[PDB]
Each structure stands twice: as structure tokens, then as C-alpha cells.
Amino acid sequence: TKSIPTVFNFENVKTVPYNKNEYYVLYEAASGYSTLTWSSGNQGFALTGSGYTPNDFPTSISPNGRTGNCLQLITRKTGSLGTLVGMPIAAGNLFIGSFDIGSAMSDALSATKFGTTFYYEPIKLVGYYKYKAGPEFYENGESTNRKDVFNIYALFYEKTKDVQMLDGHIAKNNYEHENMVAAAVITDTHETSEWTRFELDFNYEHYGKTIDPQKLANGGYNVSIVLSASKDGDVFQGAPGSTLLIDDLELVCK
Numbered sequence: 644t645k646s647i648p649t650v651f652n653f654e655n656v657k658t659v660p661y662n663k664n665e666y667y668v669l670y671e672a673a674s675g676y677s678t679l680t681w682s683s684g685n686q687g688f689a690l691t692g693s694g695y696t697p698n699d700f701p702t703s704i705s706p707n708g709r710t711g712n713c714l715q716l717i718t719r720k721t722g723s724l725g726t727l728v729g730m731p732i733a734a735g736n737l738f739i740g741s742f743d744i745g746s747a748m749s750d751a752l753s754a755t756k757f758g759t760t761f762y763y764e765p766i767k768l769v770g771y772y773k774y775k776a777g778p779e780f781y782e783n784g785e786s787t788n789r790k791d792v793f794n795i796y797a798l799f800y801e802k803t804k805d806v807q808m809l810d811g812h813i814a815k816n817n818y819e820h821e822n823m824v825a826a827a828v829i830t831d832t833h834e835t836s837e838w839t840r841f842e843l844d845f846n847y848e849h850y851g852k853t854i855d856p857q858k859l860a861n862g863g864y865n866v867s868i869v870l871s872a873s874k875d876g877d878v879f880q881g882a883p884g885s886t887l888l889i890d891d892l893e894l895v896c897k
């Protein structure tokens with residue numbers, strides 16, 4: 644049993660081809676730890692057009708980070724086909740888990756699967772952000788000056804035989820689920836061009852669960868971190884151009 648890293652730097656990417664496009668998959672490797680390979684909706688975005696390079700995608704990295712490179716989440720307008728299949732935008736996102744491309748077009752919420760095996764009890768998610776909403780908010784068949792907001796949260800839950808992963812419905816249901824143990828959700832979400840610290844405490848008291856120390860050691864608990872430039876971009880309410888930069892993210896554990 645090796646733990647994933649708990650400190651995330653956003654330095655590293657590999658380039659992956661799909662549908663005549665290429666995009667980045669971010670990963671974090673540390674000595675004595677299992678490499679975390681982040682997921683995002685980038686493969687879903689690859690379906691909506693051709694000739695995209697990594698920096699056209701909703702999820703990429705920037706060299707203008709606080710320490711070195713940083714996460715760059717930019718909500719994107721989709722290519723011709725996206726609209727016609729009801730995918731007018733694609734939120735700049737990053738999460739722990741996986742992206743099911745079989746669901747990207749029919750059920751966006753199901754496509755983003757959240758979780759990886761975690762042996763610790765997390766207490767807080769700390770990191771730094773910058774955020775600027777895009778100028779036109781897409782909602783319904785309309786483009787408005789509604790001010791887009793971003794989301795940051797983390798999940799800690801108990802696995803069961805028929806519940807191995809959660810998905811995007813968790814953020815549409817007040818973070819409620821029968822397997823849920825703790826959740827950390829950002830509340831202050833203001834725009835800024837200055838690196839701004841966040842510190843989200845995990846709330847175990849809201850769910851009233853009892854941790855099994857054995858099952859925790861046996862790998863029966865998953866954690867996830869989910870980041871998005873557009874809070875409601877999962878249901879295609881968001882602004883193209885909405886940019887969330889994240890750097891020096893750490894899952895502080897017990």
C-alpha cells in the first residue's frame with residue numbers, strides 16, 4: 644500500500660492524442676509514493692473538434708505560477724459539434740478519479756468520476772488561486788453578463804461493493820450521499836489577479852459517520868479533489884474565458 648502524494652505542484656504534463664487533437668494529462672510523482680495521474684474533461688473536449696493543441700484545452704498548465712508552473716483552468720466554447728449535442732461549453736476542470744468518454748456526450752455529470760484509494764483522514768485542503776470570470780455567461784440559449792463563479796471542493800468517502808466511485812451529481816446534491824464521510828467546500832469565490840490562499844476544513848460532523856481503522860488501512864476509503872473554473876459548467880452554465888489558476892495545493896491529513 645503506497646499513498647498518492649498529498650502536495651500538488653502542477654509542474655508535470657504528458658501529451659495525449661485523441662480525435663486528431665493533442666492535450667495534457669497532469670501528474671504528480673514523489674519518491675516513495677504512487678504517482679497521481681489527474682483527470683479532467685479534456686478527452687470530452689477532444690470530441691467537439693479537430694486541430695486543438697494542448698493550450699486550446701479547458702485544462703492545461705501555465706508557466707506563470709506562484710512557485711513554477713501552475714494549473715490553468717479555462718472554460719471553453721466547444722467546436723461546431725458540441726452545441727448540436729447539447730455541449731455548448733466545457734468547464735476548465737481537474738479532479739482525482741477518471742473520465743468516462745462513453746458518457747461525455749450523453750451524461751456529463753456521470754462522465755466525471757471522483758475518487759482514488761486513500762489511507763489517511765484528510766482535515767484540510769489548502770492552496771492558492773487567481774480567478775477572472777469570462778465576459779459572456781452561457782445559460783440556456785442566451786449569452787449574458789452574469790458573473791461566473793468557480794468551484795473548489797474535496798470528498799472523503801467509504802467504499803461499498805456497489806459504490807466504488809462517486810461522480811458529478813455530488814455537487815448538485817448539496818454534497819450528500821450515503822457513502823459520504825467528509826467534505827470540504829469553498830465559500831469565498833471572489834475574482835482576483837493576486838495569488839489568494841484558501842483553507843477548507845473537512846466537515847466530518849455533518850455526515851455523522853464512524854471511521855473503520857481496519858477498512859481505512861485495507862484501502863476501503865476514497866478521496867477526491869475537484870477544481871472547476873465554472874461552478875455550473877457541469878450543466879453548461881458558464882462563461883467561456885473564465886480562468887481559474889491554482890498552485891501549491893496540499894491535502895493536509897491527520
Ligand code: NA
Binds near residue numbers: 654708711
Ligand atoms: Na507549481
